[PDB]
């Protein structure tokens, strides 16, 4: 048996808005610790891993561990039926094929329930070991999204260059080329709209702007984003879901074979 109530349900509503367009079907692993999701896209180029611990939930009970496969698009259609200020409860009995979602309003005068059909799917889950990266950049979410969109107006691939002085996003195309330089904030803003960089080794990598624009769809979850990367390893775009948990996007780079 599994049941979980959350008052700040907008979080969940936002969560699926970041996932429905990139992943179509995923496998939610439910355990006493919380909720986990690891799934690749159809292209196998990017991976998404979401974690939400039980401590962030308002109520959380789960006797047996579950691994329920859901269609993210249908579940996002369900969550579109919930007001931004609604209280959302998820429920599913042991070894069940349906998931019940209950939206209860603040005035507690409209109560809606939905049961979406689950499915047994073939989830290919990779094993990503924990590791430290050579460069980690924290910067405003909106600035990252703006940079990705504007460079998508220029080319189809972005080259990110990280050193100690700052970060640079370059992109070239038939019309020409362009660079966006973000310097580590020295103006002591403390407002959190500042760009801090912690570097072990300078790193230059190349990624597809399409996938990054898909990633920036998780902007309303957090005010800032953390880009972690090292030499010849997938980029990690991380969005911190306040106090509750995180949403990470792994993106495989583009390497040059030297003819």
């Amino acid at each position: 048996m599994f049941e979980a109530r959350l008052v700040q349900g907008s979080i969940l509503k936002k969560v699926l808005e970041a996932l429905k367009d990139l992943i179509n079907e995923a496998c939610w692993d439910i355990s006493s610790s919380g909720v986990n999701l690891q799934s690749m896209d159809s292209s196998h180029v990017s991976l998404v891993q979401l974690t939400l611990r039980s401590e962030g939930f308002d109520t959380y009970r789960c006797d047996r561990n579950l691994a329920m496969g859901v269609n993210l698009t249908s579940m996002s259609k369900i969550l579109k039926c919930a007001g931004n200020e609604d209280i959302i409860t998820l429920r599913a009995e042991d070894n069940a094929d349906t998931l019940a979602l209950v939206f209860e309003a603040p005035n507690q005068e409209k109560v809606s329930d939905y049961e979406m059909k689950l499915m047994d799917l073939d989830v290919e889950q990779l094993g990503i070991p924990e590791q430290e990266y050579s460069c980690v950049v924290k910067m405003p979410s909106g600035e990252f999204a703006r940079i990705c969109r504007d460079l998508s107006h220029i080319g189809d691939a972005v080259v990110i260059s990280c050193a100690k002085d700052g970060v640079k996003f370059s992109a070239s195309g038939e019309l020409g080329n362009g660079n966006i330089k973000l310097s580590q904030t020295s103006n002591v803003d403390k407002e959190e709209e500042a760009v801090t960089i912690e570097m072990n080794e300078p790193v230059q990598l190349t990624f597809a702007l399409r996938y990054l624009n898909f990633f920036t769809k998780a902007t309303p979850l957090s005010s800032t984003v953390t880009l972690s990367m090292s030499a010849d390893v997938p980029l990690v775009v991380e969005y911190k879901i306040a106090d509750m948990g995180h949403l990470k996007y792994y993106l495989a780079p583009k390497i040059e074979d030297e003819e």
């Binding site: 889950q125 990503i128 040059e256 074979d257």
Partner: peptide, 13 residues
């Protein structure tokens, strides 16, 4: 010149 995949870096345990 080559777009890689997640499978190329990690492994399915």
């Amino acid at each position: 010149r080559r777009q890689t995949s997640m499978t190329d870096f990690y492994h399915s345990k």
